[model samples]
Structures are given as structure tokens and as C-alpha cells.
Target: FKSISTSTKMVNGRKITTKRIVENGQERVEVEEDGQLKSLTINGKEQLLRLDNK
Candidate 1:
């Protein structure tokens, strides 16, 4: 079976937070320290993507 009901966020850099969004109905989220994606939440749980620190 395939997992479903996932949300995708478009991030820019480490300056991202729950705020800082475009005025065009788009929310701007910040990546993790060193400019990386940290976790993705699903079903009230956090899933770590563990991206490389480049």
C-alpha cells in the first residue's frame, strides 16, 4: 500500500519561521541550521529527513 495525506512546504533558507510569508497567500518557511530541511510532521508526529550539513 502507498502512504497518503502528506503536506509539502516550500522553503528558502535558515531565516524561515512560522511567519515570513509572501503576500500572495504563500507561507515562507525557513530551512534548518546550515540551510537544511529538518523534519516533516504527519499524524501529529515528526519525521526527520536528516539532510546533509553542507
Candidate 2:
């Protein structure tokens, strides 16, 4: 028997629910507060840029 599972936490600063994507055993996600990317990262990487009009 074999099983696999993974989980990741939603970014803290995002205002809206984020989406997740798994590719090449990596994680690519986008956090959109209002059709805007509050934070974006790949493969569990941190936000290299912050887009906050606030």
C-alpha cells in the first residue's frame, strides 16, 4: 500500500481566499483579494513582491 498527502497554509496577509495549483511536485498559488494579486508564490516560496495599494 502507498499513500500521499500534502497541505499548505493560506498566506496571512491576503484579503480574499486564495487558490492553489500543484505542478511538477511544486506549489504555485495566487492570492487575490479582489481580482488582485496580494501575494504570489511558487513552490512554497515567499512573496518576492508585495502588491498592496493600501
Candidate 3:
């Protein structure tokens, strides 16, 4: 079985959110900070597709 969900919290005065989705042969992970997309991927294959911090 697979699941897809997201969670968010405040860390060091920053709001961080993480999403996990399972499909195909691998899982996808997305991360956001302060309402901005920061990273992507789960197994380090796709790498950071969207980096709002730089």
C-alpha cells in the first residue's frame, strides 16, 4: 500500500512543510519553507527541482 500526505511545522522561527507521495516505482518528496518551494524528490534521483532559496 501507498500513501500521500503533507505536514508542516515551525522550526527556528521558520515554517517548513513536507509532502510525501507514492506512485510508479518511487516516492516523491516536496519541501517548502515560509510558503516557498525549496526542494523535491525522495531518493535523491530528481534532485532539487524548485529552489526558492538562493
Candidate 4:
């Protein structure tokens, strides 16, 4: 009910991080660069919500 998967990569000499979180069967993910959230998406759903911020 609470947890996230994470990984990191390098592109154009910059740092990128990706995170995927699952909650109650709804899956969502986040991408970050420069220590900031770059974008987010939920698993092909019409409605969505973010339960945490980092």
C-alpha cells in the first residue's frame, strides 16, 4: 500500500531520476531532474492523485 521504486540515469551530462509508486492497484510514476519533479503520470487513468511530495 506504500512504497516506491527508483532508479537513476545520466543524459547530456545531467542527472535524472525516475520513481514509480504503487497504491491500491493504481500505479504512478515521477521523473526528476536537477533535484526537482519534472513530470508525472498515472497508469492510464482518467483520474489521479499524488499522495506524497519530495
Best by lDDT: 3
1-54, model 2: which lDDT tens digit per residue? 222333344557535655666655656666566456666677678744456752
Best model per TM-score: 4
Residue ranges of candidate 3 with Cα displaced over 4 Å = 47-54
Clashes of each: 1, 0, 0, 0
Q: How close is candidate 2 to the true structure, as a TM-score?
A: 0.47
lDDT of prediction 4: 0.73
> Please, what are the lDDT tens digits per residue for candidate 3 over residues 1-54?
377878788888877888877665667777889778788877557764457763
Pairs in clash, predicted candidate 1: 16-30
Give each model's whole-structure lDDT.
Answer: 0.39, 0.57, 0.75, 0.73
Error of 2 at 16 (Å): 1.0
- C-alpha displacement of 3 in model 1, angstroms? 34
Q: How do the candidates rank by TM-score, highest first?
A: 4, 3, 2, 1
Q: Order of candidates by lDDT, top first?
A: 3, 4, 2, 1
Candidate 1: residue 36 lDDT (0-100): 47
Model 4, 1-54: lDDT tens digits are 856787788988667787777777766767789989866777755445557851
> Which pairs of residues collide in candidate 3?
none
Instruction: Give candidate 1's TM-score.
Output: 0.23
